[PDB]
Design a binder for this molecule. Structure first.
Ligand SMILES: *[C@@H]1O[C@H](CO)[C@@H](O[C@@H]2O[C@H](CO)[C@@H](O)[C@H](O)[C@H]2NC(C)=O)[C@H](O)[C@H]1NC(C)=O
Ligand SMILES: *[C@@H]1O[C@H](CO)[C@@H](O[C@@H]2O[C@H](CO)[C@@H](O)[C@H](O)[C@H]2NC(C)=O)[C@H](O)[C@H]1NC(C)=O
Ligand SMILES: *[C@@H]1O[C@H](CO)[C@@H](O[C@@H]2O[C@H](CO)[C@@H](O)[C@H](O)[C@H]2NC(C)=O)[C@H](O)[C@H]1NC(C)=O
Ligand SMILES: *[C@@H]1O[C@H](CO)[C@@H](O[C@@H]2O[C@H](CO)[C@@H](O)[C@H](O)[C@H]2NC(C)=O)[C@H](O)[C@H]1NC(C)=O
Ligand SMILES: *[C@@H]1O[C@H](CO)[C@@H](O[C@@H]2O[C@H](CO)[C@@H](O)[C@H](O)[C@H]2NC(C)=O)[C@H](O)[C@H]1NC(C)=O
Ligand SMILES: *[C@@H]1O[C@H](CO)[C@@H](O[C@@H]2O[C@H](CO)[C@@H](O)[C@H](O)[C@H]2NC(C)=O)[C@H](O)[C@H]1NC(C)=O
Ligand SMILES: *[C@@H]1O[C@H](CO)[C@@H](O[C@@H]2O[C@H](CO)[C@@H](O)[C@H](O)[C@H]2NC(C)=O)[C@H](O)[C@H]1NC(C)=O
Ligand SMILES: *[C@@H]1O[C@H](CO)[C@@H](O[C@@H]2O[C@H](CO)[C@@H](O)[C@H](O)[C@H]2NC(C)=O)[C@H](O)[C@H]1NC(C)=O
Ligand SMILES: *[C@@H]1O[C@H](CO)[C@@H](O[C@@H]2O[C@H](CO)[C@@H](O)[C@H](O)[C@H]2NC(C)=O)[C@H](O)[C@H]1NC(C)=O
Ligand SMILES: *[C@@H]1O[C@H](CO)[C@@H](O[C@@H]2O[C@H](CO)[C@@H](O)[C@H](O)[C@H]2NC(C)=O)[C@H](O)[C@H]1NC(C)=O
Ligand SMILES: *[C@@H]1O[C@H](CO)[C@@H](O)[C@H](O)[C@H]1NC(C)=O
Ligand SMILES: *[C@@H]1O[C@H](CO)[C@@H](O)[C@H](O)[C@H]1NC(C)=O
Ligand SMILES: *[C@@H]1O[C@H](CO)[C@@H](O)[C@H](O)[C@H]1NC(C)=O
Ligand SMILES: *[C@@H]1O[C@H](CO)[C@@H](O)[C@H](O)[C@H]1NC(C)=O
Lengths: 50, 163, 81, 55, 198, 280
């Protein structure tokens, strides 16, 4: 973290204080797609099996 | 969910959607809840924990070791540790003493070098003046003191040719 | 009609009045939508064995109030006055 | 004939849920305190959308 | 002043803010804001007039945005320094050319004369103030009555060293014998709460 | 994150847009530090934290209405409680965040510290008078402080001691009247209420702005990325970035203006404290 502070300040010497640094995010671990139930299938049967 | 796309942590909540309502909304128009289209149970959505990172340093001229503050977040979920109303502190040792605020952390906490200690800042030395309806205090001697205060009156006159 | 979708909303309420529509607030919750994709310009009522009403909609801005349970009981017709 | 529609014709414009919030919208609606035709039959016109009720 | 670091922190802050704003302004000149390149000479050597006009237009709008942001922030800062200069002028007139009664306007303690000193982009004052010390506390009485009439001090306070009663000015212990020369009378001593005999 | 979150494409497209995302954070950080300085400047004037004597022989004057209440958990001084209740968060668990990168930082001094500072000022004023604002705090009977403050305006001391009984009643009744007036009047605290309202309004307009279209085909980054091809998305995304960034610039400038006026107000408040509280 000290090196990152040096980089963001753009100085090899940092004076006493509190400095900010790029933020963070709890990364998403997976995706979740939740479309509703499958229903009313097309009547392909007769055309292929009549 | 259906077309509603987003990122957040999920949880079933107490909100009571009407039979036709699919998803909720916040006062600021941000998505706030969703209905699961398989089991129709009502879910609640909270944004994934995010926050800014700060570095607490005593200065390179003093020592090349620092303490880090994760703003807002809870120490349990950050990938010496000390939870504070301002965030999570790591690398700073909490002490029950109190001192003059060296550098501010937030919500009354300050940090200073010693090995970077974090303490509840002291407003000042306490004392009770011996008040009474009968006694007065008068000074028998005086000191002359010279105080200096600096004020800026101007700044560099820069002109930028727009064209 | 909405660019190919035909929407139908409705509500029920028992009343005492016999002359015409009573006062009070009524918010129509929706029924299922039909994506027919065909225009409409006329309509007429089927009857059986008389006491019905008809109004026409108009583009307009409104302020709608939702309560803690998500139901709507209040409104402001934004050009009434 | 005619009759006055006082505060009717309000409908949920979308499938969204809002709690305790006051919302604003632009959409087709029946203006408040508007004239409504009393009927006992004929073929009506259909502008873009209509309101219907019955006792 | 010689030893302490950051003693002049305010003037340093002013200079640092201004220099940082300028440095940002020049740095923004390097960004291409989506154009083909961030050098107008490059675009003009590379592209024909009508097509270059698109890249030049995008670059111009970006640079103009950055410049007007800079000037707005500069105006804000100039107003802040204007307020600071007004305060400095008021302190000069009131504490250098006079003696400020308004407390703590010029240094802690009761205010004696003050001296100005010049700094690169600011002024430095030296406030000379009177500060008491070595506080001895006594017993006091609002008034004393004698021959049935209540006496109050014209200027100062009544204090007793334990056995004898004296009149002294409030800001410096100079006891004096209570006489009818430094006190004044008002009525008899029944209405005054806490009066003492003497 | 505000301009466009979790979108690597938009993150890159904004990367080559300049160093704006640094200027805005710098300005807001300056504003925050200035708020801390404002509170410190107004309240932190006493060096030693004085405390009221347990016994209350203040010549008949009655400061119970303004002195801290021992029974209260917060130790706020009765009227202070009325103020805090009248005005409209991290209150229980840290939740000062939203879906769009907007966060609120906590003040350096918590309300308990501010209350302790004001209690110290009250104790100093009651016991020592205006001396504690200049040097060592010299105790003096409060009846005598009021005698010397009467002498300041230009009325001899005797005018007090003879009327001390009546003056004490007038003082106490006036304090009670202030309590009642603050309880009853509705717009009394409008000045603070309006700043909180203005800040909330600014934040809400900033957030509601995200749903704006700015001439793009849609208002959602992921939607645009999904429905169009990379280059058409890029040209569409660019329009959203410019609009979002312009809105953020407007917000930052408004905050700077408002902070300037609040700093002027805080300086006036510090002057009033230093002059009228610590002196006459
Ligand atoms: C059409 O007929 C075929 C063959 O009869 C069906 O396919 C079979 O369906 C049965 C029952 O579901 C399965 O057990 C077999 O494994 C299937 N075999 C093959 C080769 O598909 C088919 O389901 C019928 N309908 C359609 C629409 O094709
Ligand atoms: C979607 O399909 C799922 C799976 O068949 C349904 O879930 C079942 O729902 C019934 C109630 O109707 C429960 O008794 C079962 O225990 C559920 N099983 C599972 C595996 O979920 C669900 O109800 C369906 N929903 C819709 C809207 O069609
Ligand atoms: C008032 O304070 C001054 C300053 O402390 C005292 O002066 C000192 O007196 C001692 C003893 O005589 C000397 O050793 C010091 O050199 C003096 N200091 C200076 C700066 O001259 C003075 O004695 C005090 N007076 C009273 C009455 O207490
Ligand atoms: C909103 O819905 C809740 C429940 O979803 C209603 O709360 C009930 O109110 C009745 C009458 O006071 C109580 O007997 C019940 O115990 C409550 N809870 C439940 C689960 O029924 C509430 O009345 C509805 N309306 C409003 C305005 O909140
Ligand atoms: C100011 O008055 C106080 C109160 O009388 C003095 O402090 C007391 O000193 C006596 C000495 O006999 C002690 O017995 C008490 O316990 C003290 N009380 C307190 C509250 O401190 C004090 O000494 C006086 N000021 C000076 C400079 O002596
Ligand atoms: C209070 O002050 C009086 C007056 O100075 C003191 O009494 C005098 O003390 C001096 C020195 O001891 C003697 O020379 C005088 O004869 C005393 N009497 C008078 C009338 O001056 C008294 O001692 C002081 N009390 C205390 C407790 O210090
Ligand atoms: C300061 O307060 C004390 C205590 O309240 C006062 O002392 C009392 O004086 C009355 C006078 O009538 C006596 O009856 C009491 O017995 C005293 N009590 C004690 C404990 O001594 C004192 O008079 C007050 N002094 C001033 C100047 O107001
Ligand atoms: C101070 O003097 C007054 C006035 O003399 C005393 O109060 C009374 O005075 C009358 C007339 O001189 C006497 O007859 C009484 O004996 C005095 N005492 C009372 C209680 O009435 C008072 O006693 C003297 N001492 C104090 C401490 O006030
Ligand atoms: C100072 O004033 C307060 C009220 O302004 C007094 O408190 C009241 O005291 C009476 C009598 O004991 C009670 O009936 C009230 O309920 C009290 N009010 C409150 C708000 O607590 C207090 O007694 C006064 N103190 C003195 C010494 O007179
Ligand atoms: C950080 O999280 C912990 C829990 O994950 C909080 O502590 C309590 O934990 C228990 C058990 O999970 C909950 O029932 C409590 O509600 C939690 N406390 C609160 C105030 O909600 C802990 O408080 C969190 N950190 C902070 C600063 O609040
Ligand atoms: C570094 O610290 C030393 C010791 O306190 C001091 O003498 C020196 O001036 C400091 N240097 C800087 C650049 O702060
Ligand atoms: C601080 O006090 C707590 C009790 O409140 C105790 O558990 C802890 O060990 C103490 N630590 C220090 C450094 O005093
Ligand atoms: C409606 O009529 C218009 C002509 O006025 C025609 O262009 C359009 O295709 C029709 N649409 C539907 C859904 O019938
Ligand atoms: C509409 O209703 C108003 C109010 O009753 C009435 O004054 C007006 O004559 C009516 N007009 C028509 C055309 O129904």
């Amino acid at each position: 973290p000290l090196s990152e502070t040096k980089c963001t300040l753009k100085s090899f010497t940092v004076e006493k204080g509190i400095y900010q640094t790029s933020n963070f995010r709890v990364q998403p671990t997976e995706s979740i797609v939740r479309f509703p139930n499958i229903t009313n299938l097309c009547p392909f049967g007769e055309v292929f099996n009549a | 969910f259906n077309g509603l796309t987003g990122t957040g942590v999920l949880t079933e909540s107490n909100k009571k959607f009407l039979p036709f309502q699919q998803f909720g909304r916040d006062i600021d128009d941000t998505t706030d809840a969703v209905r699961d289209p398989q089991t129709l149970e009502i879910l609640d959505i909270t944004p994934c924990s995010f926050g800014g990172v700060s570095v607490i340093t005593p200065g390179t001229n003093t020592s090349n070791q620092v303490a880090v503050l994760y703003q807002g977040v809870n120490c349990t979920e950050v990938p010496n540790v000390f939870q504070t109303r301002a965030g999570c502190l790591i690398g700073a040792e909490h002490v029950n003493n109190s001192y003059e605020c060296d550098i501010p952390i937030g919500a009354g906490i300050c940090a200073s070098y010693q090995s970077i200690i974090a303490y509840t800042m002291s407003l000042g030395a306490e004392n009770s003046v011996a008040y009474s309806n009968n006694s007065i205090a008068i000074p028998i001697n005086f000191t002359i003191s010279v105080t200096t205060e600096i004020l800026p009156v101007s700044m560099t006159k820069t002109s930028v040719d727009c064209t | 009609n909405i660019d190919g979708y035909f929407k139908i909303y409705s509500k029920h309420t028992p009343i005492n009045l016999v002359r015409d529509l009573p006062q009070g607030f009524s918010a129509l919750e929706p029924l299922v939508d039909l994506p027919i994709g065909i225009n409409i310009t006329r309509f007429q009522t089927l009857l059986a064995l008389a006491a019905y009403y008809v109004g026409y909609l108009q583009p307009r801005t409104f302020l709608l109030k939702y309560n803690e349970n998500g139901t709507i009981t209040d409104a402001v017709d934004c050009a009434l006055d | 004939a005619y009759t006055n529609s006082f505060t009717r014709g309000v409908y949920y414009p979308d499938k969204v849920f809002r709690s305790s919030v006051l919302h604003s919208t632009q959409d087709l609606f029946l203006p408040f305190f508007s004239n409504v035709t009393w009927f006992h039959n004929p073929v009506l016109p259909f502008n873009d959308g209509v309101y219907f009720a019955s006792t | 002043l010689s030893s302490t670091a950051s003693a002049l922190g305010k003037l340093q802050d002013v200079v640092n803010q201004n220099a940082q704003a300028l440095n940002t302004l020049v740095k923004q000149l390097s960004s291409n804001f989506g154009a083909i390149s961030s050098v107008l000479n490059d675009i003009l050597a590379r592209l024909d007039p009508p097509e270059a006009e698109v890249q030049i237009d995008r670059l111009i709008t970006g640079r103009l945005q950055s410049l007007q942001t800079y000037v707005t922030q500069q105006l804000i800062r100039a107003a802040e320094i204007r307020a600071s200069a007004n305060l400095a002028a008021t302190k000069m007139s009131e504490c250098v050319l006079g003696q400020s009664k308004r407390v703590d306007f010029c240094g802690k303690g009761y205010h004696l004369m003050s001296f100005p000193q010049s700094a690169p982009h600011g002024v430095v004052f030296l406030h000379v103030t009177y500060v008491p010390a070595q506080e001895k506390n006594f017993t006091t009485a609002p008034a004393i009555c004698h021959d049935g009439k209540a006496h109050f001090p014209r200027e100062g306070v009544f204090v007793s060293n334990g056995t004898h009663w004296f009149v002294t000015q409030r800001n410096f212990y100079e006891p004096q014998i209570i006489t009818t020369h430094n006190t004044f009378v008002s009525g008899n001593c029944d209405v005054v709460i806490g009066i003492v005999n003497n | 994150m505000y301009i466009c979150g979790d979108s690597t494409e938009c993150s890159n497209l904004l990367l080559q847009y300049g160093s704006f995302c640094t200027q805005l954070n710098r300005a807001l950080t300056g504003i925050a530090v200035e708020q801390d300085k404002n509170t410190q400047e107004v309240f932190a004037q006493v060096k030693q934290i004085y405390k009221t004597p347990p016994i209350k022989d203040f010549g008949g004057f009655n400061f119970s209405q303004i002195l801290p209440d021992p029974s209260k958990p917060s130790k706020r001084s009765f009227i202070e409680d009325l103020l805090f209740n009248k005005v409209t968060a991290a209150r229980d668990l840290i939740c000062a965040q939203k879906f769009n990168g907007l966060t609120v930082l906590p003040p350096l001094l918590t309300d308990e510290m501010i209350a302790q500072y004001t209690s110290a000022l009250l104790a100093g004023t009651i016991t020592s008078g205006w001396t504690f604002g200049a040097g060592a705090a010299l105790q003096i009977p409060f009846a005598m402080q009021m005698a010397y403050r009467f002498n300041g305006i230009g009325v001899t001391q005797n005018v007090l001691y003879e009327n001390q009984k009546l003056i004490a009643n007038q003082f106490n009744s006036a304090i009670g009247k202030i309590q009642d007036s603050l309880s009853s009047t509705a717009s009394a605290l409008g000045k603070l209420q309006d700043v909180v309202n203005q800040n909330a309004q600014a934040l809400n307009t900033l957030v509601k702005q995200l749903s704006s279209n700015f001439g793009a085909i849609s208002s959602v980054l992921n939607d645009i990325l999904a429905r169009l091809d990379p280059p058409e998305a890029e040209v569409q995304i660019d329009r959203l970035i410019t609009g979002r960034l312009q809105s953020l610039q407007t917000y930052v400038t408004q905050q700077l203006i408002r902070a300037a006026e609040i700093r002027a107000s805080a300086n006036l408040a510090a002057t009033k404290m230093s002059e009228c509280v610590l002196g006459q």
